[PDB]
């Protein structure tokens, strides 16, 4: 339809329609701009007035300025022709390599799957990393979250997740950078290109990028998760695939929704957020659940404010979380890359009714022996009994070997380090840690486990070290 801009506050411009009117949560092409100016309709107040969150720099908008109405909530280009492509929440390519020549569009602002479109089987999603799939394993339909930073290997673990899931399962992935820094987004794009996840040469790339940058208004940042989730919902519902939505930041999603609901005149909630926090997280975090056909799975980088857990954005986030794998620098300065802490990573699926009694027995043995190593490491650091017993030296040797064994050479680090990257399936992790905890490989040095994939190659590394 054709309406008219009548007032402008940033990402809040309202359109006065005189005829046929778009419903709540819809798209509007503001014309006369050098670009598109897409708007999102909601609030019909009168003379068909709709309060549209306005998605770009709204300098140049005049009263009575004509607005075309497109119907659909937002159409983005989805497809297998979107892989290796950077788009933004309009659906527009911002990597400057031509348009995204695909066949089927899809509307962001879709709904959750129904209760009959659900999977009642918690299949353990196996990444292929030993420490991940042994101490905090993933779930098909999980909403898992990684607690990383700058110096830790977050990007290396992300690209390793993409390659391991694209090789082991048949799933591609999508990376929604929500509030993604343009410097950091450009470095992550060149990092994926030089690692080989994105290929600019042919049609073999493995990830689709949706970068909603910080310089965009919060109306255009609270939709980045929705856009990347819409691309991944294309992969879920028309291939039946094992998909990964990597959201780099859930706090900037919550902050963008908070600033939208602040700009729309709503009385804000508690600690500074929006009233609709749990509802918006409900819409997105329940579209990323598994279905009967595909297994979208979010891995999401999460920021806790003031190092607080009781803040409402981590409260709703941890209400939807499943694994919470910690990345850190302590075990990275212990040489293990990257320091995924398992002792602070409490996965919900770690349960012998779900993953099995052998897997849970091995995981409890590993976590208990590293907790006991941390206590006896404190005692051997203060030197109270100095090697406390033979059992002390035995568990110190075992758990030092285990901490060296939790490392894995990564295929994304193969291009500049000759340590070839291995994929280690679940059964081999179980067999390896079971044979280490059983005292079978006590007669090996601790160095024979650092950066080795399976356990039999750790045997061969112990053989090649004995020179």
């Amino acid at each position: 339809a054709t309406g008219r801009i009548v007032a402008v506050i940033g990402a809040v411009v309202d359109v006065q329609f005189d005829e046929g009117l778009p419903p709540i949560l819809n798209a509007l092409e503001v014309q006369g701009r050098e670009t598109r100016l897409v708007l999102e309709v909601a609030q019909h107040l009168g003379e068909s007035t709709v309060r549209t969150i306005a998605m770009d720099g709204t300098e140049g908008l005049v009263r009575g300025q004509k607005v075309l109405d497109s119907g659909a909530p937002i159409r983005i280009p989805v497809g297998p022709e979107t892989l290796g492509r950077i788009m933004n929440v309009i659906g527009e390519p911002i990597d400057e390599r031509g348009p995204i020549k695909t066949k089927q569009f899809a509307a962001i602002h879709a709904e959750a799957p129904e209760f009959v479109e659900m999977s009642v089987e918690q299949e353990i999603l196996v990444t292929g990393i030993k420490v991940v799939d042994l101490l905090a394993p993933y779930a098909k339909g999980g909403k898992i979250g990684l607690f990383g930073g700058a110096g830790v290997g977050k990007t290396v673990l992300i690209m390793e997740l993409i390659n391991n899931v694209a090789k082991a399962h048949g799933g591609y992935s999508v990376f929604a950078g929500v509030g993604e820094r343009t410097r950091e987004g450009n470095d992550l794009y060149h990092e994926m290109i030089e690692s080989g996840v994105i290929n600019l040469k042919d049609a073999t790339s493995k990830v689709a990028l949706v970068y909603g940058q910080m310089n965009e208004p919060p109306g255009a940042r609270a939709r980045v998760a929705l856009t990347g989730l819409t691309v991944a919902e294309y992969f879920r519902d028309q291939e039946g695939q094992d998909v990964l939505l990597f959201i780099d930041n859930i706090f900037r999603f919550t902050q963008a929704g908070s600033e939208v609901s602040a700009l729309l005149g709503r009385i804000p909630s508690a600690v500074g957020y929006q009233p609709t926090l749990a509802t918006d997280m409900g819409t997105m975090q329940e579209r990323i659940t598994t279905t009967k056909k595909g297994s979208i799975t979010s891995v999401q980088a999460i920021y806790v404010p003031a190092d607080d857990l009781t803040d409402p954005a981590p409260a709703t986030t941890f209400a939807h979380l499943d694994a919470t794998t910690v990345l850190s620098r302590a075990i990275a300065e212990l040489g293990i890359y990257p320091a995924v802490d398992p002792l602070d990573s409490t996965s919900r699926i770690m349960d012998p009714n779900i993953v099995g009694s052998e897997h849970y027995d091995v995981a409890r043995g590993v976590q208990k022996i590293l907790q006991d190593y941390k206590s006896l490491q404190d005692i051997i650091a203060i030197l109270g009994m100095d090697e406390l017993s033979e059992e002390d030296k035995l568990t110190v040797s075992r758990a030092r070997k285990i901490q060296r064994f939790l490392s894995q050479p990564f295929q994304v680090a193969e291009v500049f380090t000759g340590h070839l990257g291995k994929l280690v399936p679940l059964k081999e992790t179980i067999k390896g840690f079971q044979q280490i905890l059983a005292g079978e490989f006590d007669h090996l040095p601790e160095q024979a486990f650092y950066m080795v994939g399976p356990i039999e190659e750790a045997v061969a590394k112990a053989d090649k070290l004995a020179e």
């Binding site: 009385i267 804000p268 508690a270 600690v271 500074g272 003031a306 607080d308 009781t310 803040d311």
Partner: protein, 48 residues
Amino acid sequence: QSARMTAMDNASKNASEMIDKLTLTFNRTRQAVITKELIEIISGAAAL
């Protein structure tokens, strides 16, 4: 020296526990202060 090392180990543990408890009540007091100030500003701008 043995019993002094034991007493300072236990006092560091009790002090760390009380740091944890006081950090939790600091955070909830911080959130209450932010929500109180926010409700005062919103009440002013609404009663305007």
